[PDB]
Ligand binder design. Structure first.
Ligand code: CLA
Ligand code: CLA
Ligand code: CLA
Ligand code: CLA
Ligand code: CLA
Ligand code: CLA
Ligand SMILES: CCCCCCCCCCCCCCCC(=O)OC[C@H](COP(=O)(O)OC[C@@H](O)CO)OC(=O)CCCCCCCCCCCCCCC
Ligand SMILES: CCCCCCCCCCCCCCCC(=O)OC[C@H](COP(=O)(O)OC[C@@H](O)CO)OC(=O)CCCCCCCCCCCCCCC
Ligand SMILES: CC(=O)O[C@H]1CC(C)(C)C(=C=C/C(C)=C/C=C/C(C)=C/C=C/C=C(C)/C=C/C=C(\C)C(=O)C[C@@]23O[C@]2(C)C[C@@H](O)CC3(C)C)[C@](C)(O)C1
Ligand SMILES: CC(=O)O[C@H]1CC(C)(C)C(=C=C/C(C)=C/C=C/C(C)=C/C=C/C=C(C)/C=C/C=C(\C)C(=O)C[C@@]23O[C@]2(C)C[C@@H](O)CC3(C)C)[C@](C)(O)C1
Ligand SMILES: CC1=C(C#C/C(C)=C/C=C/C(C)=C/C=C/C=C(C)/C=C/C=C(C)/C=C/[C@@]23O[C@]2(C)C[C@@H](O)CC3(C)C)C(C)(C)C[C@H](O)C1
Lengths: 179, 168, 173, 161
C-alpha cells in the first residue's frame, strides 16, 4: 500500500515484514520519510561533487575566492585538493555555521506541526506515530504537487544516492564501472 | 491470599492491573505510596539503565572525535570535565519539564485522568500502533523485564571497576 | 493565461516551447512576470552602463577622498568595481536594499494580483495613461530588456573569452 | 514421492543412490532441501569469494589500529593464521547471531525453506510466471550444489599443493 516503485519493474518485498508483522501503517510513513530525506541529501551531495570536479568554484565563477577571511583559505587551494580532502580543510567557524542551519531545519521538521509550533505536548509532533510524513510544506512558487512529481522526485533520489556512493568509492578505491 | 512470588507472606493488595504483577512486595511500599508513581519510577529507572548498559560497553571501543579515549567508562567524566556534564543534566531537566506538561512532583504528576505511567507519546517509527491488547501487554512485559535486568546489570558493570582499575 | 499579457509581440506571439507558464499556479506566473520585468531593468542599466564607462564620459571631480575618477582613463568597465571604495559600494546596496522593501510592502503583493514594482522616489501619478497605449509600452519595456539581457552576457563573454564574438572582438574595452 | 520436485532434472532426474527419501527414518521428506540449500549458499559466497579472493583485489588500509594491512594477508587457510584470535570469535559470533535471528522462518509466510525475505531478490521478478520460479530456484539450488564441489576442491587442493 506504499507509493510507486521501480518504473521498468516493480518489487516491494521487504515491506510487509515490518508494516504488518513487526510494525504497522505508522512504520510505513516513517520509512518513506527517511527514504525521501536520504534521497534529497544524496542529490545535493551529487551536485556539489559534480561542481567541484568540473571546476565551477568561486575563483572560476565569481570575484571572491577567499573563504577563510582570516585562516587564508582560498577557493583555489580547496579546488586543487579534490572533494574528499577539501571538506576537512573547512574552518571550524564555518562548520559550526553549517551545523546551525541544518539543526534549525531539523527542529522545525520536529516542532512546527502544520502552520505553527505547538507549545504544549508530551513529546514533539514528529516523535509520535507518523510524526514526519516526509513533506515539510516548503513549496515556494509551487508549480505542481501531483502523483507524477512525487514519483519522479523519489526516482531521482535513489539514483542520486547510488551515484554519489559510487563516486565516493571511486575517489577512495578501485570501483568498477567508468565515470 | 498469599504472594505468588514469595509464597509465605501475604499477597500485596492494590497491585492487580499491572504488567509485571507477580505479587512481589514484601516490604509493602505499594500499601503506602501511590502505585502510578511507583510504576513510572520503575520504567524510568529501567530506561536510564538500558541506555547506560549500552553506553558503558560501547564507550570503550568507538570514541567520537575530539574527546579522549578512557580505558574505564567510570573515569569518563574526569576526561570530559564538568561543563559538559552539567550541560547534559540541565538539558535532561528541560526534556523532563516538557515531558509531563509541567507536572513534575509527586503531587502534580498523575493529576489528570489521562497520563498513564510510562506513556510518553514517544513512538516515531510506529512500533505498537493499531494492534490488539494481548500483544501490547506482551511488549510491555519485555520493557519491564529488560529494564529490571539492566538495573542489576548497571550495578555490576560500574561496580566491577570500582574494586579493580581496568576496563570491562 | 499567456494570452492577454504584455510581452507577447508580433514575431513570436506566445513564446513558451517548454511550457513553463503552465508549470505552476497563477501566482507562479506572476513571479516570473516581475522577475523578467526586474531582470530587464537591471540589464538595461548595465548594458547602457557598459557603453558609457567605455567611451570616456568622466564625472568631473573626485569620487571619494583620494580615489577620484581616474577609473575611466584606465581599467575596463567590467573593472572599476574594486576601485570604488567600500563605503561607496555600501550605500549603493543599501539604497537598493531600501528600494526592495516598498516593492515588497505594498497593500497587495503582486503574486496576489497586486501591482508591479513602481518607482521608490518621485512616483508621478502613474499609468493613468490611456490603457491601450499602456500595453504598447510594456511591450517596449520588456523587449528592450530581452535584448539587454542577451547583450550584457555578450559583454561578459567578450571580456573573458577573446574571439568569442566576431564583430565585437575588435573593440577596445 | 519426490521425483517431480525441485532438483530432479536431466540428465539424471531423481537420483537417490542412498535411499534417503525412500522412507521417513528421520523425516526425510522435509529439512533435506533445507540442509542441501544451506551448505551451498555458504559455498556460493565462498567460491565467488575465494576466486576473487585469489585474484588480488584487497580492501584498503589496515585490519586494526596497529598497522597490520589487508594486503599483507594472503589467501587460504593461511589467512586465518594472520587473523588474531579475538577476530576469529567475532567473525563467528555476529554470524552466529544471524543463525538464531534471521536464518529461520521469522514471519511465518514462507512459501519454502530459504524463504525469509520476500521482496528484495524481486529483480523485476513479479512479472515472470510461476514457471520462472521453478527455473531460478533450480538455478539457486544447482549453483549451490556445484559450488560445494568448487569449494571442497579449493580447500583440499591448497592442502595437497
Ligand atoms: C527554522 C525555520 C522556521 C520557520 C520557517 C518558522 C516559521 C514560523 N514560526 Mg517558528 N521557530 C523556529 C524556526 C522556524 N519557524 C525556531 C528555530 C524557533 C525557536 C526554537 C521558532 C519559534 C517559534 C515560536 C514561539 C513561534 C513560532 C511561530 C512561527 C510561525 C508564525 C506564526 C504563524 O501564525 O504562522 C503560521 C503559518 C501559516 C498559517 C502558513 C502555513 C504555510 C506553511 C507552508 C508555512 C510556511 C512554509 C514554512 C514555514 C517554510 C519552512 C521550510 C524551510 C525549508 C524554510 C511561522 C510558520 C509562531 C507560531 O507559529 O505560533 C503562533 C510562534 O508563536 N516560531
Ligand atoms: C537510506 C535510504 C533508503 C531508505 C530508507 C529506503 C526505504 C525504502 N525503499 Mg528504497 N532505495 C534506496 C534507498 C533507501 N530506501 C536506494 C539507494 C535505491 C536505489 C538502489 C532504492 C531503491 C528502491 C526501490 C527500487 C524501491 C524502494 C522502496 C523502498 C521502501 C520499501 C522497501 C523497504 O522496506 O526498505 C528497504 C530496506 C531498507 C531501507 C533497509 C536498510 C538497508 C540496510 C540497513 C543496510 C544496507 C546497506 C547497503 C549494503 C548499501 C549499499 C546499497 C545496496 C544496493 C547494496 C522503503 C520506504 C520500494 C518502494 O517504494 O515500495 C515498493 C521500491 O519500489 N527503494
Ligand atoms: C546573512 C547572513 C550571513 C552573514 C553575514 C555571514 C557572514 C560570514 N560567514 Mg556565513 N553563512 C551563512 C550566513 C551568513 N554568513 C549561512 C546561511 C550559511 C550556510 C549555513 C553560511 C555558511 C558559512 C560558511 C561555511 C563559512 C561562513 C563564513 C563567514 C564569515 C567570514 C569569516 C571571516 C562571514 C562574516 C566563513 C567563516 O566563518 O570563515 C572563518 C565560512 O567558512 N559562512
Ligand atoms: C544625501 C545624502 C548623502 C550624503 C550626505 C553623502 C555623503 C558622502 N558620500 Mg554619498 N551617496 C548618496 C547620498 C549621500 N552621500 C547616495 C544616495 C548615493 C547613491 C547610492 C551615494 C553614493 C556614494 C558613493 C558611491 C560614494 C559616496 C561617498 C560619500 C562621502 C565622501 C567622503 C570621502 O570622499 O571620503 C572621506 C560623503 C560622506 C564616497 C565615500 O564615502 O567613499 C570615499 C563614495 O565612494 N557616496
Ligand atoms: C587492535 C584491536 C583490534 C584488532 C586486532 C582487530 C582485528 C579484527 N577485527 Mg576489529 N575492531 C576493533 C579493534 C580491533 N580489531 C575496534 C576498536 C572495533 C570497534 C568496536 C572493531 C570492530 C570490528 C567489527 C565490527 C568487526 C571487526 C572484525 C575484525 C577481524 C576480522 C576477522 C576475520 O575476517 O576472520 C578471519 C580482525 C582480526 C570483524 C569481526 O571479527 O567480526 C568485524 O566484522 N572489527
Ligand atoms: C550465495 C548467494 C545467495 C544468497 C545469500 C541467497 C539467499 C537467499 N535467496 Mg537466493 N539465489 C542465489 C544465491 C543466493 N541466495 C542464486 C545463485 C540464485 C539462482 C539459483 C538464487 C535465486 C533465488 C530465488 C529465485 C529466490 C531466492 C531467495 C533467497 C532468500 C531465501 C535468501 C535471502 C528468495 C526470495 O527473495 O524470497 C525469500 C527467492 O525467491 N534466491
Ligand atoms: C536553560 C533551560 C531553561 C529553559 C526553560 C524550560 C522551560 C520548561 C518548560 C515549562 C513547562 C511548560 C509546560 C506547560 C506549562 C505550564 O503550565 O507549567 C508551568 C510549570 C508548572 O506547571 P503547573 O502549574 O501545571 O504545575 C503544578 C502546579 O500547579 C503546582 O501545584 O512551571 C514552570 O514552567 C517552571 C519552568 C522552569 C523555570 C526555570 C527557571 C529556573 C529557576 C530555578 C531557580 C534556581 C534556584 C537555585 C537555588 C537558590
Ligand atoms: C529613508 C531611510 C534611510 C535609511 C538609511 C539606509 C540607507 C542609507 C544609504 C546612504 C547612507 C548615507 C549615510 C552617509 C554616511 C557617509 O556617507 O559616510 C561615508 C562612509 C565612508 O566610510 P569609509 O570607511 O569608506 O571611510 C573611511 C575614510 O572616509 C577615512 O579616510 O560610507 C558609509 O559608512 C557607508 C554607509 C552604508 C550603510 C548601510 C545602511 C543600513 C542597511 C544595512 C542592511 C544590510 C544588512 C542586512 C541585510 C539583511
Ligand atoms: C558580436 C559583435 O561583435 O557585435 C555586437 C553588436 C552589438 C550591437 C554591439 C551587440 C549588441 C547589443 C545591443 C545593441 C544592445 C542594446 C541593448 C539596449 C536596447 C539597451 C537599452 C537600454 C535602455 C535604457 C538604458 C533605457 C532606460 C530608460 C529609462 C531609465 C527611462 O527613463 C524610462 C522612460 O520611460 C520613462 C519612465 C519615461 C518616458 O518618457 C521615456 C523614458 C525612456 C524616459 C552585441 C550583441 O553585443 C554584439
Ligand atoms: C533486493 C535488494 O537488492 O535489496 C532490497 C532491500 C534493501 C537493500 C533494504 C533496499 C533498500 C534500501 C536502500 C538500498 C537504501 C539505501 C540508501 C542509500 C544508499 C542512501 C545513501 C545516501 C547517501 C547520502 C545521504 C550522501 C550524502 C552526501 C552528502 C550529504 C555530502 O556532503 C556529499 C559531499 O560531496 C559533497 C557534496 C561535498 C564534499 O566536500 C563532502 C561530501 C563528500 C560529503 C531495497 C531498495 O528494497 C532493495
Ligand atoms: C524565455 C524562456 C527561456 C529562456 C530564457 C532565457 C534566454 C533566459 C535568459 C536570461 C538572461 C540572459 C538573464 C541575464 C541577466 C543579466 C543581468 C541580470 C545583468 C547584470 C549586470 C550587473 C548586475 C552589472 C554589472 C556591472 O556592474 C559591473 C559588474 C561593472 C559596472 O561598470 C557596471 C556593470 C553594469 C557593467 C527558455 C529557457 C528557452 C525556456 C522557455 O522558452 C522560456
Amino acid at each position: 500500500t506504499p507509493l510507486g516503485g521501480e518504473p521498468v519493474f516493480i518489487g516491494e518485498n521487504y515491506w510487509d515484514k515490518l508494516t504488518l508483522e513487526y510494525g504497522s501503517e505508522a512504520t510505513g510513513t516513517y520509512l518513506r520519510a527517511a527514504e525521501l530525506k536520504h534521497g534529497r541529501s544524496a542529490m545535493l551531495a551529487v551536485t556539489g561533487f559534480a561542481f567541484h570536479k568540473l571546476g565551477l568554484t568561486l575563483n572560476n565563477i565569481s570575484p571572491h575566492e577567499y573563504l577563510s577571511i582570516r585562516d587564508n583559505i582560498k577557493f583555489a587551494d580547496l579546488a586543487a585538493m579534490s572533494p574528499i580532502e577539501a571538506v576537512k580543510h573547512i574552518p571550524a567557524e564555518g562548520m559550526a555555521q553549517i551545523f546551525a542551519a541544518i539543526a534549525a531545519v531539523e527542529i522545525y521538521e520536529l516542532t512546527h506541526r502544520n502552520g505553527k509550533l505547538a507549545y504544549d505536548e508530551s513529546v514533539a509532533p514528529g516523535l509520535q506515530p507518523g510524526g514526519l510524513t516526509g513533506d515539510l510544506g516548503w513549496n515556494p512558487l509551487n508549480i505542481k504537487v501531483t502523483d507524477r512529481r512525487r514519483l519522479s522526485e523519489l526516482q531521482n533520489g535513489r539514483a542520486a544516492m547510488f551515484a554519489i556512493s559510487a563516486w565516493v568509492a571511486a575517489e577512495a578505491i578501485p570501483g568498477s564501472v567508468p565515470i | 491470599e498469599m504472594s505468588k512470588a514469595v509464597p509465605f507472606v501475604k499477597a500485596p493488595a492494590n497491585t492487580a492491573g499491572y504488567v509485571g504483577d507477580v505479587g512481589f512486595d514484601p516490604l509493602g511500599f505499594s500499601d503506602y505510596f501511590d502505585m502510578k508513581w511507583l510504576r513510572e519510577s520503575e520504567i524510568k529507572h529501567g530506561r536510564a539503565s538500558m541506555l547506560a548498559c549500552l553506553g558503558f560497553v560501547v564507550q570503550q571501543y568507538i570514541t567520537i572525535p575530539g574527546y579522549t579515549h578512557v580505558d574505564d567508562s567510570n573515569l569518563a567524566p574526569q576526561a570530559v570535565g564538568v561543563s559538559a556534564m552539567l550541560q547534559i543534566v540541565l538539558w535532561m531537566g528541560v526534556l523532563e519539564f516538557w515531558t509531563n506538561k509541567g507536572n513534575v512532583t509527586m503531587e502534580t504528576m498523575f493529576s489528570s485522568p489521562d497520563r498513564v505511567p510510562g506513556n510518553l507519546g514517544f513512538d516515531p517509527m510506529g512500533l505498537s500502533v493499531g494492534k490488539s491488547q494481548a500483544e501490547k501487554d506482551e511488549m510491555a512485559l519485555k520493557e519491564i523485564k529488560n529494564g529490571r535486568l539492566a538495573m542489576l546489570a548497571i550495578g555490576g558493570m560500574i561496580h566491577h571497576n570500582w574494586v579493580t582499575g581496568e576496563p570491562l | 493565461k499567456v494570452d492577454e499579457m504584455p510581452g507577447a509581440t508580433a514575431p513570436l506571439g506566445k513564446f513558451d516551447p517548454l511550457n513553463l507558464a503552465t508549470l505552476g499556479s497563477e501566482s507562479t506566473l506572476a513571479w516570473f512576470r516581475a522577475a523578467e520585468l526586474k531582470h530587464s531593468r537591471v540589464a538595461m542599466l548595465a548594458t547602457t552602463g557598459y557603453l558609457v564607462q567605455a567611451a570616456g564620459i568622466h564625472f568631473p571631480g573626485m569620487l571619494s577622498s583620494d580615489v577620484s575618477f581616474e577609473s575611466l582613463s584606465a581599467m575596463k568597465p567590467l573593472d572599476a568595481w574594486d576601485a570604488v571604495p567600500e563605503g561607496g559600494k555600501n550605500q549603493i546596496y543599501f539604497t537598493i536594499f531600501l528600494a526592495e522593501f516598498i516593492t515588497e510592502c505594498k497593500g497587495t503583493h503582486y503574486t496576489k494580483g497586486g501591482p508591479l514594482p513602481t518607482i521608490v522616489f518621485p512616483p508621478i501619478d502613474f499609468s493613468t495613461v490611456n490603457p491601450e497605449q499602456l500595453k504598447t509600452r510594456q511591450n517596449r519595456e520588456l523587449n528592450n530588456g530581452r535584448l539587454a539581457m542577451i547583450a550584457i552576457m555578450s559583454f561578459v563573454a567578450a571580456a573573458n573569452i577573446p574571439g568569442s564574438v566576431p564583430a565585437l572582438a575588435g573593440n577596445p574595452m | 514421492a519426490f521425483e517431480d520436485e525441485l532438483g530432479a532434472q536431466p540428465p539424471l532426474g531423481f537420483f537417490d543412490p542412498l535411499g534417503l527419501v525412500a522412507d521417513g527414518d528421520q523425516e526425510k521428506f522435509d529439512r533435506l532441501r533445507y540442509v542441501e540449500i544451506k551448505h551451498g549458499r555458504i559455498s556460493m559466497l565462498a567460491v565467488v569469494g575465494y576466486l576473487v579472493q585469489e585474484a588480488g583485489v584487497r580492501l584498503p588500509g589496515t585490519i586494526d589500529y596497529s598497522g597490520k594491512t589487508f594486503a599483507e594477508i594472503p589467501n587460504g587457510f593461511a589467512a586465518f593464521k594472520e587473523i588474531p584470535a579475538g577476530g576469529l570469535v567475532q567473525l563467528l559470533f555476529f554470524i552466529g547471531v544471524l543463525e538464531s535471528s534471521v536464518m529461520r522462518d521469522l514471519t511465518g509466510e514462507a512459501e519454502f525453506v530459504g524463504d525469509f525475505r520476500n521482496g528484495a531478490i524481486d529483480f523485476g521478478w513479479d512479472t515472470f510466471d510461476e514457471e520462472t520460479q521453478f527455473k531460478k530456484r533450480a538455478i539457486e539450488l544447482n549453483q549451490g550444489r556445484a559450488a560445494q564441489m568448487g569449494i571442497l576442491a579449493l580447500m583440499v587442493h591448497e592442502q595437497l599443493g
